[PDB]
Structure 1
Amino acid sequence: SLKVDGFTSSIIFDVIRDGLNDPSQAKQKAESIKKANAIIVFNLKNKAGKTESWYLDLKNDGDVGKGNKSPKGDADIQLTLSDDHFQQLVEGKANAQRLFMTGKLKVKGNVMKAAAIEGILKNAQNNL
């Protein structure tokens, strides 16, 4: 339901939302917001030339939703890459730093904080 047709990686946002919002993740969620203190927007591009965005609010209460903007504020970080590369990145087939360095991943806002997000997200979302 955060999934959008024509973006095959987007199903991942539902899985991330369920993991992060799981009330058993309350502590992890709070620690992640403390660490990240950031609203991160993902702008995905597909081959048909479409753009779709999702937000990850690790700054206020912890939320994942559809849109290029949290309802509780503007993005601190914007990450722009293709559907394909986002898939690869979530799988671990591509490294975010290599994608950045080869022009596949564009970042607006702090690149150091951007790098840290991967590990901070991993911890908050992982509800097993």
Structure 2
Amino acid sequence: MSLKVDGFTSSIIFDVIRDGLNDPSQAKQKAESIKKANAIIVFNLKNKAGKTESWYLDLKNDGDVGKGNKSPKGDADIQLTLSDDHFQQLVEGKANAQRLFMTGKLKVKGNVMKAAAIEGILKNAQNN
């Protein structure tokens, strides 16, 4: 879709990530991020209105970003649940995923060692 959603200020970030990942001129890093991450990662964002919106970052099959809590090409390997404000802090680099986890701000389903690597995964994903 156009991945931005009302009520989730950080959600424009998924539009940027999709564009950078899908850029035909980045075929190499896409293939490199798929071989390193080797996971479907779902983000369940929670806003200060009480709502839940989800997005998926398929870095195990062909390299897709989209709306929803399930990739159409598989089921999630990792689920990250956190507030819209904390996700935006994490992308801006003013919050650390491992500290967010330890203080109860980020919940993780699946392999925690790939969640720990999320902001590394997020850089090399769309880094044009």
Whether the aligned pair in 2 keeps the contact of 1:44 and 1:80 (CA below 8 Å) is yes
Specify the SS of the correspondent of 1:10. Answer: helix
> Which deviates further from its counterpart, 88-97 or 118-127?
118-127
Q: Is the 2:90–2:119 Cα contact (8 Å) retained in structure 1?
A: no
TM-score for both structures, normalised by structure 2: 0.97
Q: Is the Cα–Cα contact under 8 Å of residues 46 and 82 in structure 2 kept in the other structure?
A: yes
CA distance in 1, matches of 2:103, 2:118: 20
Which residue of structure 2 lines up, in the alignment, with residue 79 of structure 1? 80
Q: CA deviation at 1:121?
A: 2.8
**Distance apart, 1:119 and its partner CA:** 1.2
Partner of 1:121: 122
Aligned residues: 127
Give the secondary structure class of the aligned counterpart of 1:9. helix
TM-score, normalising length: structure 1: 0.97
Q: Is the Cα–Cα contact under 8 Å of residues 37 and 58 in structure 1 kept in the other structure?
A: yes
Flag as ranges the 4+ runs of structure 1 deviating above 4 A: none
Matched position secondary structure for 1:56: strand
Asked if the contact 1:39/1:75 (under 8 Å) is kept, the reply is yes
Are the equivalent residues in 2 in contact too, given 1:36–1:113 (CA < 8 A)? yes
Distance 1:94 1:116 in 2: 13
Instruction: Kindly report the root-mean-square deviation, in angstroms, between the aligned alpha carbons of the 2 structures.
Output: 0.8
Q: Give the 3-state SS of the residue equivalent to 2:10 in structure 1.
A: coil
Partners of 2:82 and 2:106 within 8 A in 1? yes
The answer as to whether partners of 2:97 and 2:118 remain within 8 angstroms in 1 is no
Shift of 1:17: 0.4
**Identity, % of aligned positions:** 100
Structure 1 unaligned spans of 5+: none
What secondary structure sits across from 1:72 in the alignment? coil
Q: Contact 1:32–1:121 (CA<8 Å) still a contact in 2?
A: no
Secondary structure at 1:42's aligned position in 2?
strand
Q: Distance in 2 between matches of 1:83 and 1:105?
A: 11
Q: CA contact under 8 A between 1:36 and 1:117: conserved in structure 2?
A: no
